[model samples]
Target: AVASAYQRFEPRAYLRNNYAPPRGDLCNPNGVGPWKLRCLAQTFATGEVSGRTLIDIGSGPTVYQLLSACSHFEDITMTDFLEVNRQELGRWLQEEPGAFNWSMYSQHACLIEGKGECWQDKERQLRARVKRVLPIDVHQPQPLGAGSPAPLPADALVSAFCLEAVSPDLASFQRALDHITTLLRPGGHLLLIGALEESWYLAGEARLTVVPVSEEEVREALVRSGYKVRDLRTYIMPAHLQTGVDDVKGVFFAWAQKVGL
Candidate 1:
C-alpha cells in the first residue's frame, strides 16, 4: 500500500474517531485496549523511570504513554508533525469541552504503579510537567524545529505509533528512528510502542500505510541507531479486536537506552 502524503492529514477525523479514548478506546474490553494496557505496563516496568525530561516524540493526540512518567519525570515535552494534534492536546490541557478524558488512563496507570492515587491531581501533575508541545520532523536533522523551550538530548524519550506509521518505507523508518534518538542523551532511555505487522490503519476517512515491522526488525533498527536493548515485549491482538478499523496483528513495546552514559 502506498503511504498517504503528509499534507493530506485531517485533524478533526484524527481526534474525533481514531484516537478518542475510553469508548472506541480504553473501556472497550474486546479491542486494542487490553493490548495497550499490558504493553504500557511492561514499558514502565522496564526500569526505575528516574532522572528527568521524558520527551514524547511524534506524539499524537493521546496522553496515554506519559501517565506513568507524570509521577517521576521533572518535565514532559510532546511533539507532532501536525498542528491539529497539538491543538487537541492543548484543549485537554486547558480544560476545554469535548477533550478526551484521560481520567481512566491516569487512574489505571496509578494502579500499575502500585498506588491508587487521585486521578485529578495526576492530571494536574501531568499538566504541570508538560512544559512544551512543539513540532517535530524526523526527516530533518533537527527534528525539534524552532521555538523549542527545552534543550535537545533529553534524559529519556517515548513515542507511539509514529515512526513506522508515518515513514514511507524501511529506510525512512530507520532514518527517522535514528533522527529521534539523536535528541536523547547518552544513557537515556528510549521507550517505544507501535503496531506490529500492521500494513494499514484507517484514521478517519483516510487509510494510512504502515511499514509492517517485526520484533526482530525493531531490535535491529535500535541497534543500528546505537541503542542497547533492555526489554522487548509483544502482545498478539485478539481476533475480536481486528474489527477492520486497523489491520494490526499485534502491538510491541521496546525499552532501550542510548549506548552510553
Candidate 2:
C-alpha cells in the first residue's frame, strides 16, 4: 500500500518543493535548511560519532544529510525503496549534468563546522566515500534484503524523513524502526531526523501520508527499540518557513546509540 502510494512520486518535484525557495534560502539563519545543517554539524563536532562505515536509510533523492557525516566515516552506503530516488542519487554521485545542486548545503555544513574546506571538496569527498546506492525496504526484517552486499552491523546509520513518512500508521512506524535497527551493531550510533506532527506532504502527483510523532513518543520508541538516546532536540517551524509543502509543525533530531545485541 505505501509502496504503491510512491509510484506517482516525482523526485524532481519533491526536491523543488522541499529543498528550494523559502526553506532552502540559507540567508535566514533560522530557516529549515540551516536548522537541519546546524543540528547535524553540531552533533558531529562533538567527536563522539566517528566510525569506519556508515549507512544512510531512505536517501530519497537528497544528499544534504550526508554533508556533515561524510567526514567522519570512511565508507558510506546510501539506500532507498524507490528506483527513482536511487537514480537521483546516482546522477549526482556520477557527476552527470542536470543533477540537483547541493552546493549551498555543503557550504552551510562547512561554515557551521568551521572546517574551512571548500564546498566543492566536500561534495567530492561525499561522492567518493559513498561506495554503493542500494534498495532498502524498512518494513522488511532484512532492510537491504537477504544477501545484499552492503555492509551490515554498520558502525553508524543516518535517516531523515524516512520511518514515519513511509509507514501508514504508528504501529507500522514502530515496526519499521525495529526492522532497520537490526542493521546496526551493538553500541553503534544512529542519527535520525524526522518531521514532527506532520500528517501529509505533497510531492508532485503523490500526496504522501506521514505518521505524526511527538518527541516523547520518539524517545519511548527509541527505548523500546533498544537504543539509548544521547541527544534529542526539536525545532519549531517558523511561519515564514512553513511554505505549505507539508504541514510540519516542527522537526526533531535524535542521536541514539544502539545499546544491546
Candidate 3:
C-alpha cells in the first residue's frame, strides 16, 4: 500500500540519479511496475476473499491493495502510523478532488471482476465498504492504538511495505510480523506485499530505511509469527526500474493464514 506514485508509469531514466519513478509513472507498487495492482486485482477477482472484516496495516497513502478485495469484506479498516498518510486516505474516502485519484485502478479492477463500464460505482462501493481509517504502530504488542473499539477481529489482513520498511533490523521485522498478526482472527488470512532484498527506498525528500529480506526470510518470519504461508509470488524488477530506487531487487506477495484459534 506504499505510494510514491500509484499511476505515473513513465520511464525513470531522467531522474536517473534520484532512483525514483518518473513524475508520470503513477504509483508503481513495489517499485517494479503497475502489474502489482493488476496482479492482485485478478487474484481477488476470482472471489477467493470473503468475510466480515479486513484490516490493511501501514497503508501508506495508497488504495491499490484494497481495490481488489474491498467488496469481499463487509467492513474494511485501513490504517497507517502517520497522520499525513491517514489524511491522504481520508481524502480519498471522502472523494475529495486532491485525493490521489484511483479511478483507472477501479476501472482495471472492474474489468478483472467482469463488471460494467461505470468505474464510479465500483469506487463508491470501496468508499462505503471502508468503515475506518485509523492509526497503528507495528512495533508494539498492541499495534491498534487505543480509543476506537472495533466490533470483530479481522478475518483477513493486507499489509504492504510496512514491516520491513519500518523495522530497523531483521529481528525487529520478525517481531513486527508477530505483533501485526494479532489484528487477525484465528485461522484468518494475511496477504502481504513487500520489497524483496530492499535495503531502503526514497519517498520524496526523506530517505527511509528497510531491513533487507529474502524469500526465505519472508517465509520463515510468517512461520515464526504463527502463520502458515499458503501462496507466494515474486516479481523481478527490470533493469529500467532499478535506477537506484531503493535497491529493491524484487517485489513479493504472500498469502498466509493464522495457525490456531
**Top model number, TM-score:** 2
Q: Write the per-residue lDDT of candidate 1 for residues 1-261, one digit (tens) a residue.
A: 233354556656654554454324665544555456555666666555566777898877888778776667877898887787788788888889887776767766665566667777778888889988887777876776654686666888888889988887889999999888878998888888888999877666667878899999999999999999988888787765556667788888888888873
Output the number of the lDDT-best candidate. Answer: 2
lDDT of 3 by residue, 121-155 (tens): 87887899998888888888888675454545788
By lDDT, the candidates rank as 2, 1, 3
Q: Which stretches of candidate 3 lie above 4 Å from their native place? A: 1-34
Give the winner by lDDT: 1 or 2. 2
- The TM-score-based order of candidates, best leading, equals 2, 1, 3
The local lDDT score (0 to 100) that residue 56 gets in candidate 1 is: 91
- Write candidate 2's Cα lDDT for 197-259 as tens digits: 999999999999889999999999999999999999999999987887899999999999998
* Model 2 misplacement above 4 A: none
Q: What TM-score fits each model?
A: 0.89, 0.98, 0.84
For model 3 the TM-score comes to 0.84
RMSD of each: 2.6, 0.9, 5.6
